[model samples]
Target: ISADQVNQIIYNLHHDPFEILGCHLLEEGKNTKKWVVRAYLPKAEAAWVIRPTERKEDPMNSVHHPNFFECIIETPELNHYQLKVKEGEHEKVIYDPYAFSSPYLTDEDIYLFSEGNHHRIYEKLGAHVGEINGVKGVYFAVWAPNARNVSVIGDFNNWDGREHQMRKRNYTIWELFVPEIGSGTVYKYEIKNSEGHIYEKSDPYGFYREVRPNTASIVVDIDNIYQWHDEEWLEKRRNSDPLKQPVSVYEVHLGSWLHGSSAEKMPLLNGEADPVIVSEWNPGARFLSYYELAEKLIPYVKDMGYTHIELLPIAEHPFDGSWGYQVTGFYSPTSRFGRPEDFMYFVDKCHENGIGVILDWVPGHFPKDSHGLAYFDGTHLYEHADPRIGEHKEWGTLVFNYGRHEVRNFLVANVLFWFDKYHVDGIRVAAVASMLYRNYLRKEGEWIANEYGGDEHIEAVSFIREVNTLLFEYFPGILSIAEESTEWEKVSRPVYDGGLGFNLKWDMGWMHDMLDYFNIDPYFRQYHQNNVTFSMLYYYNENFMLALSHDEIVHGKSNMLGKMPGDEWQKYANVRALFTYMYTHPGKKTMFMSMEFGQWSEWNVWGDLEWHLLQYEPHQQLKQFFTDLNALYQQEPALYTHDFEYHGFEWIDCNDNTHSVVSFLRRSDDPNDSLVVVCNFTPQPHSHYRIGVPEAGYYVELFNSDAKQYGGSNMGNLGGKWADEWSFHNKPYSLDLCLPPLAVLILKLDPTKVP
Candidate 1:
């Protein structure tokens, strides 16, 4: 019925209906008119005063019984109320089922928006949570259970969260209408308490997420989709049977890989110098656009003989300092290097050139920015309420609440999104230790177990398994490398066996052992001899990769090349020996970006490699030596093929000081091909050193560590013929070779080269 009939009945009965119901009429009506009484009451409170007052003497006090309006009618007739105002224009109203309920709707389920098409309806019907309007095309809103003030800011509002004031609607939810602002706009709110303390929050239902350096939540239309280019490519790669080759990745931060070019600091119309600092040198290094980088790098990578390019975390991150670890934008690739499509094209081009691209992904933590996921919708939406479990102690970031179903979907979707959107060869899961354990470096009382009586982070292990399985089953030849250094045993196992189903896991043991050996003096290397030889046991049976990664060169560690404890001559010699050993050693191998050029200083994200070192004798020598080593690795199948299987490896002599030497054999299982490596680690040179060879005829010095091209002193070790002869331990087939001090010699015994 109309307000007039209800008001008359209330007035005649001396009951203030407006005061009791907390409602106001929009217009006045005459009592003599044939008024239709219509009450738009909350559903739960509808049962009270079911029929309007029938008489003037109907005691207003009688209708005022507190219990009279307490219980809403539950019958079918109370579902909706109607009155005949006019024949064709009958007034109608429906009881809101959501009203009077103590429980609140979840952020995802509700459309309690601040500045959109339904703003007025929220103002009239729903509780006025909060609203703020200042700055261009920006509006602020708050949904505090008990907050006094809230402000909004962002790109649409110029980040002035304090200026925009929110109008309070109810004790809890608040909202405000902003003009010229809609989807694709970035915005945030600042909530205030009774004490006037303000806290910033991101939009719970924000359309787009962004990284730190660009702190704006872009308004993306979630319904929009893109046509993909690599469907066939993905299928082809996924179906290959034996899996692709073990990835020997060269992890690189794209923006830092080139000098002078930057994705963030392009020239602006204001004519001011772009101050956005990127990882690379040369301010103009970004001139080589995405297409250019792919085209240019292919030849270089092919020449280097690397199987894959493992880029540093390329998922869109805003802060460069966290080194792509603290991700703010989960979906948007960082605009720091190029556009999202451009990066996709870069990966596509790599695939075209037979180069696999492995992205470094950080699923462990996220930054606590206003436009980030922290405190979204005025609540800890993405993270958990339990501070002990939800906080990333070491990183000071927000750990995702993996226990939540939506959170699991978000993470798994992110993984599939990368492979689906961009034809990435694989992913190197970073900081997995943080995702796998509950007590990851927790002090006494620092952490608490979850409802499941353990660290909630362990819940993510199942999600990880699903992600890897989907990747393996959907995409061909794709590899997911686990970078957990902790005791997460299931990281490299199959999903069906209750493992994460990763294709490979980084051999942290090998890294530690090798680094330990390299740190000591060569004279004392025997003490750590197990470092080089002992890792073979773990490397052979497991799906593992040997790495000299970025971790070794960052922070206070000396540059990888400079880690050698020796003078320049000794250092270069040591580096050359290390490369020879690394290439010839078991398992897959990896090197960092600047290590190829003999960078003597720890790597810095803010600058380029110390390229001037190329002019120096020691550095130049090291560079050439590595280049030759790459060549040797490519040309010699015996060295690499043995890595895939457990064949073609045997140590000849482990004990020999002064004239110290270690010999090993490498061959295919077919026995038709093989090569023997003889290394003289001693400081003395040997004349006509005799080493065993299969079917000796004529042997050529395939590669000599003393070659002038590799910065070694030019010593003659020309090709020579050999015959079966008695040698040490009565072996018949032996090849004599001239050895230089601290040098390695590769002897290729082929009948075609024999005279």
Candidate 2:
């Protein structure tokens, strides 16, 4: 049979799988040149059927477009097709369908390759591809070690697997050429075993995702595609000051933050959005979107005395279950919440409202997907390809190849992407513990440490240093925080010193020690005051935030109020006590969402918090207390003024005689305004508990932790004035003071009001 004759035969079989059904070359008329080709149908009982012609082109280009086939049949059953090359009746069969290469046999399901995998594949690496090629159709490749056969299928092929069998290369690699299927096209890999059983799996580096059971990758077009409207918002966020002003944060998961009266029935947008009326008119939508959240939250924050808003992670992670951790798109914001620009608007709005925005950023690992950076060019490209370097066995996520230039660029660009595009004021790098130590918290020998006495992922640390340095250089006021809980040195040090260059590190040890100390009975706390005071050593040169973060409320830990170790009323008071300590303690303070209102149950992310608990429980009093504390924090110079510096605080007395009472002096470094704090942790009310004041002058009770507004029992005096005078404390400078039980008092020194 001649080539022209074969074209007809191929065109007729364009829709079928040639591997299963047999095809024949035929002769017609008397001329040897006038030959025809015929394709035979597969047996009726076979698992494979002839693919339809509507889906594929003719056989002439079937090798390039694998869909042109005559019929499909069960494999290992004489799957033959004659490639007729007839010249003067000496016809020869050049290629047969049965001569195709076999599949790889291994344990892992999908083979992922990206810039992240290059470090393991090549040593002393060369230049890497910074961006994907825009020319020609995209080329997709995968490694399915255990499959007998593999094929590419998706919206591009109508989910047909048989005709598009991937061509096998030398190294257990399988590849297919896709024409014009650029970013955001959903596709998947179909693999069949020796028994002809097929299964569908998602691509490890998929850029996009299907909504459900269908395992297909989305080819997202993330290249300068959308017009953003948050330029003003970005500027405002960058300029707003969080330390000097009031800050109030409302953490939200976009999917479940609000499901309201109109929501259950109305056709919802892909993501939740507060209506303009709700945002502009009603008070409820405050802190919902950038505009409304800022406007509504601003008034409340100013009134309540907060100047900053802390947001959860806003990076683009595909799985909602990840809660934004299993990030697939490094540069793209998750479309699940709103468009990327919408989030930018939110940040800008916060800045415009005089509220600083602190965003949570996850640079730990990338999720495994095909259309993503997983296996670009059919190689373990972006991550380490070996278990020792390739995957995160604990997280089931793909570890990035931070050592590669392009990978570093990709990650650092993502960090800058949030700051540059969205104008985020601060970044709280999440799970920094995973990045700092190679072993992390792993048991001995359970994990592989890098050559540098840590995980081989040193590139992550170097990248972090570079990013922080760049952040400080580009955005002078931007605050970058390290969430490293371990005692990793230089976390909050400057970048030039070979440090991570974080402006602040979370003082996790302070929280742990304080929380543990507070959990004991108030009487028992007297013996543990040293623990609380000693933890301050961690804050030597760096600023820190004392956090009661979200993790504490999850993992079966009790909520703030539930851990109070008493009845509901006592519990609320204890919580207030804890807050007073946090506010008065020597560090910046942050608490989770419901802790301010005395939430008794652990937090759940799927719905609104127990807002109704306020109806019966009077958590509003606790809210009012927080409002007062924030107010005091904004105005008072002693509580937070010298937190980063050393001149603002001085211990007046720390003797064992008053085990329950402790006195400290907080004053402005310039020596203008000053405050004296006296606390009695004992539950027994003190009628005239003697305390010492720092200086002699007229002193006023500025704030009382035992005030009735915060569900206190009113055991302490409400408003009192004391004249600072010289008293005996082995000196002539101290003044006598009276304190109440389980209470805190702030005495402001006013020279003009001296008596």
Candidate 3:
């Protein structure tokens, strides 16, 4: 090596340090070769090369660079040796990092990663506890193909880049095995790009990260840790079908669901504009840890009769207010809660209790934090370089370059990562509308068009399709939900048939229409009955989940209780009717936190839910009705089993516009398992409302929102009524039943059990 080249290696500016350092054979004469051992140990007092058997020692000469050590052996059979270096007062025998020449990533792993088909690429890219050649160490790997030199900087090396520069693999993945270092070591990659710019970036595939106010990646051994006892849940879930299951999800943001005493407001991820205020990390009013949530939250969800608990993004992020929407650590469960194993415990416990866990996934955009993925390697590596197409100006975030194979694989593997690491049952993708359309938040001339000159983003569509397809194939009976707002065709259909391949899509149309109708005064509701009845027009367009999600309850939209337009009594009645309708409607269900017991306050991320509301009588009865409603839904196969099929739902009457009344029947494969549902929008009670029945027999009032137990006026047909063989509303049998004001009714018929 030349003097300048050796100087570049010593200065940590060389693109290929392994070429000059480590073992090499110098041919002095023909058939007489000598082995040369070279090493660069920074801040060393002395250095030597020691052989294993003879304990033979040879002093290393200070070469061109003062810290560069060199030695030549007479025999060429020196495949392994130790470096003895004196740094401070202590002499340490070190296994030279450049000694091992074997590649950690196989040819298939490298090829598949480049081809964007490596679904388990995470196993090869992160800081993992490993053993190479009988030596135990931590393998640190990162992707920085555009960088001139990359080094591992952390507390172990005193955050010095010159100490442990990594080896460049295929000019793409830079890696190093730091010997004697196990888990819990914090580190970051110090990358010097082609432009002579140096940037310190966190590991994109780090399994664990430091808590907020600290931005280094932690080396945690995620494999073979935290023994999981969810085999029964997993086996049952694998064999059982989710389409026929009662999927009542309770969507919760952990920090706000219940919190500690920290009342201090901190901006979500170092707040810039319209900063979301989240509870500070101090002891008071802060969110509970993962283990704490397992004890408190799991029980709460179990008692609520919800089949699944859908958590908002729990990935590591800087800001509390973003609610994990603008994430930085895509692979890590947020350190705010606890360790990765702590999160594993939470999921395991949920499974033990027969509750499925769904994590809300965000693949659309990422925040531009300095230590994050933006401007990685001093270039727009993860995101696009062009501001017009790459930037989400309104969101102050960056869209990923989905055309890039590595970036697409990063997201796809991230979805599978959660299920593999955390044992999550489903993934609910967020903000897909932004990814599918290039001109989503842009003007006509402000966005780039696809090759075919269409608004549809070609690369992002392919990326979405890849993620959804691979996750389902890898995890059977696992759900893929899309929170898409647009009218994209076949979003929840199968991938091979040219669909997006998500199993469930959020029913945004249902949420908007139902809320809009419920907000209207009852006196004027008859004039605009279409608002309430419009959801069924396109209900079967996709396999939908009727989501009254956190989006509807936050950002000035008010809580579900406040969305009602009436006095207190009427508001509660309206809420009851709305909830009963969703439960009995032709879709799966999801309601956000604080909505079950009718909290009037809109969701506040910095504090806990208004649990005090449950102490009130109206709230108690409302919750009781909710419990009963869930019991009824789970017991009756008609409500959920055939939800997406045409035979599952039939409308008896949707045209009684003047009185603002609607009636429907939820059916199952068994004729006797049918349930008739009636909803009265107006506040006026009807003495004898004639509605069609499926059979002529004894009908029972299985559930009524107007029952006295639910704080209603009790204007019902006293438990059961017999239907006569007469034609009404196009049905063979019709029943004359008393309908209550601003309430919902569910009835089932049997031969006996007369009232």
The local distance difference test score of each candidate is 0.59, 0.57, 0.84
RMSD in Å for model 2: 20.0
**Tens digit per residue, CA lDDT, model 2, 613-688:** 6675358888888888887887776666567666766666666434656667776655656777777666666675
- The segments of candidate 2 whose C-alpha lies over 4 angstroms from its true place after superposition are 1-258, 261-304, 318-321, 369-378, 441-457, 728-736
Best by TM-score: 3
Cα deviation in Å at residue 721, candidate 3?
A: 0.3
Residues forming the 10-long window of minimal summed lDDT in candidate 3: 267-276
Q: Write the per-residue lDDT of candidate 3 for residues 217-305, one digit (tens) a residue.
A: 99988876688888668767866789998999999998788765345432222121121224334345555677778888999888878
Higher lDDT: candidate 1 or 3? 3
Q: Is candidate 1 or candidate 3 better by TM-score?
A: 3
Q: List the candidates' TM-scores in order.
A: 0.69, 0.68, 0.84
Candidate RMSDs in Å, in order, are: 18.3, 20.0, 15.0
Error of 2 at 665 (Å): 2.3
Instruction: Give the alpha carbon lDDT tens digit for every residue of 341-430 in model 1.
Output: 456667766766667788887777787866567765455656877777778766678888776654565566577667655667788887
Superposition error at 247 for model 1 (Å): 3.4
Q: Where is model 1 more than 4 Å wrong at Cα?
A: 1-212, 219-236, 241-246, 261-275, 279-292, 295-299, 448-457, 615-621, 642-644, 657-660, 715-717, 720-732
